[PDB]
């Protein structure tokens, strides 16, 4: 409108909102569909749900490879959104009980889920990188605000999805049975609308082309670099001053520098799966903590489950508050938050949140009687301080990570560093699954462990962020 912000990002943030809406509206009904429509084992349903989630987490690698190495982006977004819409069509087609039964339903549902995972993994990094591409490299201050608005759109989509999903699967009969076809078709229409609105802004975008088979060049350059050193019975200059400088008889400098930056950022990101796994162990145990504390609140009775909704709402409140007030106040003085101090401070805040959760659990345990009521029974409040701290950590770490991934990536591989950021979440999710079964510790002792682990992870990231060499 005025300046410094293209009209294009309007059909980027809206698309992201519409996509998250549909994704969270479908994933919510997925498990009920498995259990009460397909009539699957609990083990089978949970395993299929977790496999689908993991594939969704892991596919953005393929999406970013396709985008950067070939076809550019805004063409991988379009085609993978078409694949996403096809997957939604199949999934909603398999929930119709009229045609086929127990075999067409299973096949169509599984194929649709595979296509949905493919689409999501390739709309995730490409859309963020494409929206970032709309700003001139000099406008590095408007890009951060755009990324804040992008995260706000994500969280708003999640919140409206949570608030609107139970209405669709509430006492609706498709054909003499519970209506799952609508529950899966509404997300399909939302995805179709997202694709339409994104395509509507084609003439305004700033589509840049790919810089060649960048992924193959990167792999071959790394392979040559590693292979050169193997001078078992010889060697006078295998590689000095770096492990890539003597992969220079080919792979000109403009590629060696790009792979250097890529490897630097990847080594920096190494520790983030542990942070993601540790911070993901709060939406399950905090529910157990809530179940042990009063939730009448005088005005409105609060069920422990509903407290989960306090995270997206607090993110919505904190994003504008952080960007427009707190960061400006910090900038008032000489204090300089370098986008890596922000992430470390977010990790410290998450550690503090888990320590506060441990303290609240300790207070809960120390109950003694004076239907008998324990005098020292905490209200569902006192869960606010940990929700405030953990939410501020997510705003600082997550919004800063998207910008850091883009600003530090070579132009040839802008969406590959976005896949690297998403790859940490994918690996972190695997850690949660591998460690979920191992649970035999007290709630207070567990939180004091996660707080301590989250501290050690932050010291490792802080030390490696100190020696990081920024891209230039």
């Amino acid at each position: 409108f005025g300046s410094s912000y293209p009209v294009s990002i309007a059909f980027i943030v809206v698309n992201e909102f519409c996509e998250r809406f549909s994704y969270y509206g479908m994933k919510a009904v997925l498990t009920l569909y498995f259990l009460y429509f397909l009539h699957w084992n609990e083990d089978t349903s949970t395993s299929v749900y977790h496999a689908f989630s993991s594939l969704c987490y892991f596919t953005p690698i393929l999406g970013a490879a396709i985008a950067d190495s070939w076809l550019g982006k805004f063409k991988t977004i379009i085609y993978l959104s078409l694949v996403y819409v096809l997957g939604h069509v199949f999934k909603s087609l398999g929930a119709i009980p009229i045609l086929g039964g127990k075999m067409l339903h299973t096949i169509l549902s599984l194929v649709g889920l595979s296509l949905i995972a493919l689409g999501t993994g390739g709309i995730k990094p490409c859309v963020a990188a494409f929206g970032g591409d709309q700003f001139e490299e000099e406008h590095a201050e408007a890009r951060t605000r755009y990324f804040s608005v992008f995260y706000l759109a994500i969280n708003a989509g999640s919140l409206i999805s949570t608030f609107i999903t139970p209405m669709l699967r509430g006492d609706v009969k498709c054909f003499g049975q519970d209506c799952y076809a609508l529950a899966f078709g509404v997300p399909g229409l939302l995805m179709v609308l997202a694709l339409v609105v994104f395509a509507m802004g084609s003439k305004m975008y700033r589509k840049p082309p790919p810089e060649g088979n960048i992924v193959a060049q990167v792999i071959k350059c790394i392979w040559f670099a590693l292979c050169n050193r193997f001078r078992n019975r010889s060697g006078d200059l295998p590689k000095r001053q770096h492990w890539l400088d003597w992969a220079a008889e080919k792979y000109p400098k403009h590629l060696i520098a790009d792979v250097k930056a890529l490897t630097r950022v990847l080594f920096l990101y190494i520790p983030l799966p542990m942070f993601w796994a540790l911070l993901d162990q709060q939406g399950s145990r905090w529910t157990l903590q809530a179940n042990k504390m009063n939730g009448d609140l005088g005005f409105f009775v609060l069920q422990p489950d509903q407290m989960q909704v306090l995270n997206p709402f607090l993110v919505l409140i904190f994003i504008p508050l952080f960007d427009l007030v707190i960061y400006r106040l910090i900038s008032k003085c000489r204090i300089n938050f370098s986008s890596l101090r922000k992430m470390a401070v977010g990790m410290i805040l998450a550690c503090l949140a888990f320590a506060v959760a441990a303290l609240v659990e300790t207070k809960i345990n120390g109950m003694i009687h004076p239907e008998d009521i324990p005098v020292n029974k905490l209200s569902i409040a006192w869960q606010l301080p940990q929700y405030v701290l953990v939410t501020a950590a997510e705003v600082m770490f997550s919004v800063t990570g998207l910008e850091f991934s883009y600003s530090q990536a070579p132009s040839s591989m802008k969406s590959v560093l976005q896949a690297a950021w998403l790859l940490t979440v994918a690996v972190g999710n695997i850690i949660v699954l591998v460690v979920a079964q191992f649970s035999g510790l007290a709630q207070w002792a567990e939180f004091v462990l996660f707080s301590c682990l989250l501290l050690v992870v932050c010291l490792i990231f802080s030390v490696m962020a100190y020696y990081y060499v920024p891209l230039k």
């Epitope: 259990l35 397909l38 009539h39 699957w40 084992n41 609990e42 083990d43 089978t44 395993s47 127990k102 299973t106």
Partner: nanobody
Amino acid sequence: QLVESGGGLVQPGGSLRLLCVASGRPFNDYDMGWFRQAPGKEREFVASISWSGRVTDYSDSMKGRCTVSRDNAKGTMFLQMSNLVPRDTAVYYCAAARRRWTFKATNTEEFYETWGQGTQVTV
């Protein structure tokens, strides 16, 4: 393994509370389901309770209101039929299936592999 059952005659609009005790491998390793076989009829699905009792399902009829519970300690399973009628005067069976990965419906006979003998609840 070695499931059992217990129950008997009931009033036209009374209620019944059936038992199913496992006398073998631990009860937490088995998905359980209730079936009925009216005289001169095919076996019908009644209710199903998964391991840990987290997931429960009831037949479309669910005459009145059924409720399946299970305590994996002592391995006992309960079915609470509430508003019985002149119908459903069938022989009620208990079925157990070891946990595994399968795509067969949890509300079908072929899903279950240990059908214990059945009661003779009548109305």
